[PDB]
Amino acid sequence: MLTLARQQQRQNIRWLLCLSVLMLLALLLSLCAGEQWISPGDWFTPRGELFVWQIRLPRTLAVLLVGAALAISGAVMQALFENPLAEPGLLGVSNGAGVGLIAAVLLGQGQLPNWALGLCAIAGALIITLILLRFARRHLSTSRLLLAGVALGIICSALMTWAIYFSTSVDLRQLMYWMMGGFGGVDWRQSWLMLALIPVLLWICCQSRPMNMLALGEISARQLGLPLWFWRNVLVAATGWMVGVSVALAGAIGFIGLVIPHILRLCGLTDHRVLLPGCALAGASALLLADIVARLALAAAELPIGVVTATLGAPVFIWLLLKA
């Protein structure tokens, strides 16, 4: 094995270690602070069974998964569209699931189960991710894709807002918490969605080869014997899956799919054999904090996870622009 290679791999394992830690260190912290603090020991008390197990844990688990997803998603999209600015939130694949999600809530309010909803979101994502990819093949451009995406996002936001006002079964809050993401109402009764995230999450996190290739660029990727169409479509699915579910789980959270991936490349995680796992870990932790903060900062009302991730996002992104 090449020298520079072995070394890089070492430092990579180093990060996958530190990151592996920070997440737990965050998983712990999430379970202890909600409104009132708690302690690992003061957990096994009548109170813990309530909060810590029936409230907190569920939520903290959803965050991890959604976080590790959105993070990976962005990674994946960037690979597909051969573009760093590729991410769920910006290109509008999130609002894609939005539309699809609401579509269900309106055609069968309260009748359709969460899992039944998840599928409707996964559809919302797939569509957009597809429409986007179509525009990606016919006119490969970082501007084009980044344009269309923003646009579709708007279109979807319109379809959503317009369909809510019409039915009047609107709640200025529900609408905002969704458009601006939030883990407020995450209960074990959504655990089916949570689980539904693990399969793909674990799978896609192992398909590094296809993406390193893919990353070289269409032609190179092809002439090297890569089943391009397959993997392109495959990831499109794996994307819509994770994305949609995440939306059904916590609405539209944005700006972690963009930043987390790049930051990890900065640390030297480039081989997708590392960037994926690295993304999962940095994705999870990253969103936990975001959630915890969204959870304490204003005692009167829980902050829309979205605002948080966005507030910290825009800045850490600007910096990334100057550094890269």
Binding site: L4, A5, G217, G225, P227, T270
Partner: protein, 231 residues
């Protein structure tokens, strides 16, 4: 000896009906003006494009080949490709090797094209001439008979792009060394004196059709060159 065969190949007016032979251990130069089809042709022979005509590669026709195997018998180099953001030259090259094992060979090729000090540096951070050599390198490592037994054809579209006289001479040695090992090298000639001095055979497309073929010394004659360029 003949590795590839082109039978009435042509897609739209850019590439008119054209046929010819690609003989192993030889260097063929696609000579002609701008628009004369050269790139389109190469794209076919590679397998990147499909269409009207018939191309058979070492027996079976391209269309019959599976991507995977094809990549072991031939390498393709597009006219230009955007360097992958955040990817160290050494990884770029490795990925092209069918046998990651042969690590030393990588160092040799990288050296030959002045890249030993460039390894480990992200591709998105190279200069013009640098990236090119990095690409050529990557393609060579992929099909060198040294590391790959199935290597038979190396298609290059405008390789000398960005290289200086030196870097050119550098690659000349590599290509020669390659056909001497029995490789079939097909590339779009840029300089006539070059093609005369280094090529073996040479098709002379124009408008999209083949005005000539055969030994470069016969094909590159004033009558033809004039018929092709108009001077």
């Amino acid at each position: 000896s003949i590795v590839m065969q082109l039978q009435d190949v042509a897609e739209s007016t850019r590439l008119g009906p054209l046929s010819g032979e690609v003989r192993a251990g030889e260097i063929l130069h696609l000579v002609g003006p701008n628009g004369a089809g050269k790139s389109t042709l190469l794209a076919r022979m590679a397998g990147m494009t499909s269409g009207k005509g018939s191309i058979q590669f070492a027996g079976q026709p391209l269309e019959a080949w599976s991507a995977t195997k094809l990549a072991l018998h031939r390498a393709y180099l597009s006219q230009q490709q955007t360097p992958p953001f955040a990817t160290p030259v050494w990884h770029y090259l490795t990925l092209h090797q069918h046998d990651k094992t042969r690590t030393e060979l990588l160092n040799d090729v990288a050296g030959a094209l002045a890249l030993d000090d460039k390894l480990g540096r992200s591709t998105n951070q190279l200069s013009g001439g640098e990236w090119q050599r990095v690409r050529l390198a990557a393609v060579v490592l992929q099909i060198t008979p040294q590391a790959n037994p199935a290597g038979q054809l190396l298609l290059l579209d405008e390789p000398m792009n960005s290289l200086d006289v030196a870097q050119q001479s550098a690659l000349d040695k590599i290509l020669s060394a390659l056909c001497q090992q029995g490789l079939a090298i097909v590339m779009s000639s840029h300089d006539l004196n070059h093609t005369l001095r280094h090529a073996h055979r040479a098709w002379l497309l124009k408008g999209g059709k083949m005005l000539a073929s055969g030994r470069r010394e016969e094909v590159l004659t004033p009558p033809n060159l004039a018929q092709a360029y108009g001077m």
